[PDB]
DNA sequence: ATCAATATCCACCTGCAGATACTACCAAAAGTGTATTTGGAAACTGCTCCATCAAAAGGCATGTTCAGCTGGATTCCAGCTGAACATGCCTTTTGATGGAGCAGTTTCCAAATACACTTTTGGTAGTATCTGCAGGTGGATATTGAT
DNA sequence: ATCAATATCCACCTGCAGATACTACCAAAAGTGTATTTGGAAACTGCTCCATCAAAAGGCATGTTCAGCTGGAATCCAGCTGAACATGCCTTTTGATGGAGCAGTTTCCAAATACACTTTTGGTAGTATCTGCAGGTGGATATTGAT
C-alpha cells in the first residue's frame, strides 16, 4: 500500500483533498488528476507563502514564524497581496507607511 | 456614570487606530463620525452570524457564525477557523 | 467526542522543507490553515462553474488548471500551474 | 523652560508606534458590551464563544485602520493634514458602502 | 438537425407582467435583462443555501434553507415580503395533495 | 386530472423547472420538495416588484412598452433594488440624471 | 454681436442631454478595432461573435462613466470643478483597483 | 490573404468620446491631460476581461469568443452585466 | 554653533507560556481489488454567423482661434487641535464555581430517491399581419446673455 | 429692466422594425404511481466553556491649560480650457458571399462510480521535558528643540 500523495510526489494529502472535491457538491464527478493537481498547486502556494515569512522572521531576528511574518511576507510581495487583497490575517497589522507630506521640515 | 456602550469607544482608542491608519492630525469631529461608522459595521456583520446562529438553533454565537458573516460581506478573516 | 481535520501537520511538513530551523506559532498556523482552505474553496469553486458553463459533470485536472489561470496572478500561476502539472505526470507514471 | 515637543512630532512618534505593533486598540470589555448589545437588538438571550467576540474585534479594527488610511488619502488630496467627516464620507462612498 | 431548445423564464416574467400592469408591454432586450435578473437571484440564493446546507452538515436543502438565504440576501423590506410570499407558497402546497 | 405543482402553490413561476434546476445545479446532495416552491415564489415577487416600478417609470415617460432604460430607473430609484443590484451592470439602461450641485450656475 | 454661451453653460448642457440617453458614446468600429487588437496580442487567430463586442463595449462604457463619477466627487472634494488625473487615480485607489 | 496589422487603436478612444463619457458620469471641466489618463486605464480595463473571457475560450477548445465568454469573464471580476444572456 | 531633555537602541538575563517529543489508543479514512457503468472524446457534417468586400454620404472628428474664468500662488490670522500633566475611574487580571447548552448517541418515520409509465408543454420553425414609437417637421415657449 | 439669439418644448406625422398572432410539430419536461431507502428531528445526556463573582491594582481615560501652526478666507493673475467655426475624413449603413467553425448526431471505451475488504493514519489524550522570546535591566547615543 502506497499513497497517492508519495505517488504523486506531494506532502499535502492527495486522499483528503479527493474526498473534499467529492463531498464539497462542486460536481457530480472529480477525475483522478484533479486532487493530484489542485494538492500540488496549495502545497505550492504553501511553499511560497513559508518562504518569503521565514525571511521576514529572520529579518527580525526571530526563528518562529507568527502572524505577523505572514502580513509582512504577504503584503511586501506584489502577486500574494494581489491574490489576498480582501483577506485579514488576525494579529498581522500593517506595513510601517508614512505619508512623504506628514514628515516634518 | 451613564454612559451609552457606543460611547465606550473611546476617543484615544479611535486615535490610536487612526495613528496605525497613518494618520497625524485629527478634528474633533471625527470620533463621533467613526462611533457611528464603527456600529454600522457590527450591525452588518453581527445581523449575518446571528442568523446563522438561528438558523442552526443554537443559542451561542460562534466564531465561525462570525467568519461566514464576515466572508459573504467581503471581509474574509484568516485565523479563527474555516 | 469527536475529530476536527486541518492542514496542520503538512503545512508543518512543508516549513521544514523550505526552512528547517524555522518554527510556528499556533496562531500562525491557525492563518496557515484558513489560507489553504480559502485557495481551496476558490479553484474548486471556478473549476465547478467551469464545468457548468461546458456542461460536464466532471472536474478534471484540466478544469482546475484554468481555474488556478483565472485566480492566480501572473507568475504565481505559471509555477502553480507547472507545480500541478509536475505532479500528475509523476502520479500518472506508477 | 520645561520640555515641549512641537505639535505634530509625538503624533508621528505614535504612527510608528502603532504601525510597529499588532495588538488591538480598543479596550476588551467596552467592545464586548457594545457587541452583546447590538446582538440583543437581532435576538434576545444570545451567548457568544469568547473568540466569536475576538474576531469581530479583528475584523472591526482592521477595518476601521484600513478606513483610516483611505481617510488619510483624502485630507492629502484636498490640501490637508487634518482628516475631517467629509474625508471619511468621501472614502466610505468611493468605496462604495454608501451613497 | 434541429438547434436544441433554449429555456427561459419570458413566458412567466411576462404572465407577472400581465398581472402588475395589464396594458404595459416589454421589449426583447428589456426581457432579456429580467431574464438575466432571474438567473442572477435564483444563483445568488442557490448559493447562499448550498453553504449553509454545507456549513450545518446537511445534505439536503429545503424551504428553511432557502428562507434563510432570502434573509442574507435580500435587503429589509424586500427580505420580509419575500418570506411571507415564500412561506405561504409552501404552505399551500402542502395543503393539496 | 394532473395539476402543476405551480398551481398546487398558486404560483406562475415555474416550480418544476426551479427544482430541477436546483438538482442540476450541484448544490446540495438532495432537495426537499419545499425548496423550489419557495424558491420560485420569491423569484416570482421579486420578478413583480421590478416589473411594477418599471411600468411606472415606462408610464411617467409617456410610453407603453418597457425598455431597459425604464428598468434601470426603477432599480436605481429605489434603494433597496439599486442595493440588492448594487454590482450590477444594466445594458442600454443609462444612469439617472444628477448634477452636482456646486457645477450649477449662480 | 456673434452670440456666444459662457463657458460651462454648454458643458451643463450636454451632462443633461447624456444623462437623459443611454446609447453607447464610443465609435462602433474603433472600439471592436481595439479588442481585436488587444485580444490578438493575447492570442492568435480569435474571432468574435459581434454580441461578445457589443458586451464589451456596453461593460467599458459603464464603468467608465461610474469611474468619471467617482473623480467628479474627489476634485469637488479639492474645491475644484475640473478632473484631472489625479483625481481618477485616487478614485482608483480607494475602489482597490490600484491600492 | 491576412488583414491588415493592427496598432495604435487605443487613439481611436477619441478627445469627444471621453468628454461624452464624462459628461454621462456629471463632469463639468476636464483637464488637458485627462485624455491620456482615461485610455491608459480603459486599456488595463479591457485587457483584464478580454484575458479571462478568451481564458474561457480556450478551455472550451473555441476559436470564437462568445458573449458569454465575456459575461462569464464579466462577472468573476465583479462587472455582472445584464442583457447578454447572463 | 552649543547644550540639555528624552527617546531609542543594543547587549544581556531569565521566567514561562507555549511548543515539543513520547507512548498509546482507535475510528475514520485511505488503499486495494473486482464488477459495472457511462461521460464525453472522435468522427461526421449540417448550417449558423463571422470575416470581408463594395460603395455612397453625412455625422462627427480634427485643428484652429479667441478670451472667460478657473486653478494655483501668496498672504494673513483666528482658533482648533496637539502636548503636557494632575486625578481617579474602571478595565484587567485570575482563580474558583455553577450550569447553559453544544455536541455526541440512539431511535425511527416522514420524506427523500429510484424507477416505469403517461401526459403535457414550452421551444422552434414557418409565414403573415398589427403597432408603438423613432425621427422629421413647424411653430410656440423658454433660456440665456448683452446691454 | 428690454430684447435678441438660440435652445427647448410639444403637437403632429409616417415608415417600419419589431412585437404580436396562429398553426404545426415534438423532444423533453413534467406529473402520477409504486417500491425502497434514509436524512435528520427528537429525546436524553455528558462535559465543554461560557457567564458571573469577588478583589485588587494600576493602567489608562478624562479634564484642563496654553499656544503652535493649521485651515480657510481673501486677493491677484497667467494661461488653461470651453465655445464656435471651417474642413473633409471615415464611420455608418446596406447588402452580398464564401466558408470557418460552432453545434447536432451517433458510436464506443478509457475512466468513472460502486462495493467489499484490508490496512494505514491523523486526531487524540495524557505525560514529561524543552526553549524562543517577552519583558526588564543598564548604559550608550540618537533625536529633538531650546538657545
Ligand atoms: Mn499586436
Ligand atoms: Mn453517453
Ligand atoms: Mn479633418
Ligand atoms: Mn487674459
Ligand atoms: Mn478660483
Ligand atoms: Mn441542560
Ligand atoms: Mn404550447
Ligand atoms: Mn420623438
Ligand atoms: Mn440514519
Ligand atoms: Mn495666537
Ligand atoms: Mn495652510
Ligand atoms: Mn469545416
Ligand atoms: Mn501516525
Ligand atoms: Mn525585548
Same mark, same amino acid.
Given at each position: ?17 479527493? =474526498?473534499?472535491?467529492? #463531498?464539497?457538491?462542486?460536481?457530480? =464527478? ?30 527580525? #531576528?526571530?526563528? =518562529? ?39 516634518? #521640515? | ?11 484615544? @482608542?479611535?486615535? +490610536? ?38 438558523? @442552526?438553533? +443554537?443559542?451561542?454565537?460562534? @466564531? ?10 467581503? +471581509? ?7 | 467526542?469527536? %475529530? ?9 511538513? $512543508? ?6 530551523? &524555522? ?12 489560507? $489553504?482552505?480559502?485557495?481551496?474553496? %476558490? ?5 465547478? %462553474? ?9 472536474? &478534471?485536472? %484540466? ?24 505532479? $500528475? &505526470? ?5 | ?12 512618534? *505614535? ?7 499588532? *495588538? ?9 458590551? !457594545?457587541?452583546?448589545?447590538? /446582538? ?15 474576531? !469581530?474585534? *479583528?475584523?472591526?479594527?482592521?477595518? !476601521?485602520?484600513?478606513?483610516? *488610511? ?20 468621501? /472614502? ?6 454608501? /451613497?
Amino acid at each position: 500500500a502506497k499513497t497517492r500523495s508519495s505517488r504523486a510526489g506531494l506532502q499535502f494529502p492527495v486522499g483528503r483533498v479527493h =474526498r473534499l472535491l467529492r #463531498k464539497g457538491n462542486y460536481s457530480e =464527478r472529480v477525475g483522478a488528476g484533479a486532487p493530484v493537481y489542485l494538492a500540488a498547486v496549495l502545497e505550492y502556494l504553501t511553499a511560497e507563502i513559508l518562504e518569503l515569512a521565514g525571511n521576514a522572521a529572520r529579518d527580525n #531576528k526571530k526563528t =518562529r514564524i507568527i502572524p505577523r511574518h505572514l502580513q509582512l511576507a504577504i503584503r511586501n510581495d506584489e502577486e500574494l497581496n494581489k491574490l489576498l487583497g480582501r483577506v485579514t490575517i488576525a494579529q498581522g497589522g500593517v506595513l510601517p507607511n508614512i505619508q512623504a507630506v506628514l514628515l516634518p #521640515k | 456614570v451613564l454612559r451609552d456602550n457606543i460611547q465606550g469607544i473611546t476617543k484615544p @482608542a479611535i486615535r +490610536r487606530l487612526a495613528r496605525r491608519g497613518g494618520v497625524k492630525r485629527i478634528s474633533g469631529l471625527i470620533y463621533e463620525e467613526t462611533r457611528g461608522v464603527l456600529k454600522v459595521f457590527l450591525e452588518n456583520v453581527i445581523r449575518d452570524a446571528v442568523t446563522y446562529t438561528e438558523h @442552526a438553533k +443554537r443559542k451561542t454565537v460562534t @466564531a465561525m457564525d462570525v467568519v461566514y458573516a464576515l466572508k459573504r460581506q467581503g +471581509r474574509t478573516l484568516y485565523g479563527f477557523g474555516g | 467526542r469527536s %475529530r476536527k481535520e486541518s492542514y496542520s501537520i503538512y503545512v508543518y511538513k $512543508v516549513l521544514k522543507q523550505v526552512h528547517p530551523d &524555522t518554527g510556528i506559532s499556533s496562531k500562525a498556523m491557525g492563518i496557515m490553515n484558513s489560507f $489553504v482552505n480559502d485557495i481551496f474553496e %476558490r479553484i474548486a469553486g471556478e473549476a465547478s %462553474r467551469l464545468a457548468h458553463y461546458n456542461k460536464r459533470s466532471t472536474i &478534471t485536472s %484540466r478544469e482546475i488548471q484554468t481555474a488556478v489561470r483565472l485566480l492566480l496572478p501572473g507568475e504565481l500561476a505559471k509555477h502553480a500551474v507547472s507545480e500541478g502539472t509536475k505532479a $500528475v &505526470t509523476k502520479y500518472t507514471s506508477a | 523652560k520645561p520640555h515641549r515637543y512641537r505639535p505634530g512630532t509625538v503624533a508621528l512618534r *505614535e504612527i510608528r508606534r502603532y504601525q510597529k505593533s499588532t *495588538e488591538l486598540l480598543i479596550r476588551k470589555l467596552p467592545f464586548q458590551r !457594545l457587541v452583546r448589545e447590538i /446582538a440583543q437588538d437581532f435576538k434576545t438571550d444570545l451567548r457568544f464563544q469568547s473568540s466569536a467576540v475576538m474576531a !469581530l474585534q *479583528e475584523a472591526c479594527e482592521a477595518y !476601521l485602520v484600513g478606513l483610516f *488610511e483611505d481617510t488619510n488619502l483624502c485630507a492629502i488630496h484636498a490640501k490637508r493634514v487634518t482628516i475631517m467627516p467629509k474625508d471619511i464620507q468621501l /472614502a466610505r462612498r468611493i468605496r462604495g458602502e454608501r /451613497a
